[PDB]
């Protein structure tokens, strides 16, 4: 579901894809 090590947007949130491409750590923020 994600490219390992890639930083991507999900809504206005910023996510880093985990090594397995099967996980991510997300910084949550509001959209306008």
Report the SS3 class of residue 26. strand
Within the chain, strands assigned E span: 7-10, 13-17, 24-27
CA distance 16 to 20: 12
Instruction: Read off the DSSP letter of residue 19.
Output: T
**Both structure tokens of 26:** 């997300």
Cα separation, 32 vs 28, in Å, equals: 13
Cα separation, 19 vs 29, whole angstroms: 24
Residue 8, phi-psi category: left (phi > 0), alpha (psi -120 to 50), beta (remainder) = beta
Distance CA 10, CA 1 (A): 12
């Amino acid at each position: 579901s994600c490219e390992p090590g890639r930083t991507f947007r999900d809504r206005c949130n910023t996510c880093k894809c985990g090594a397995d491409g099967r996980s991510a750590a997300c910084t949550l923020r509001a959209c306008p």
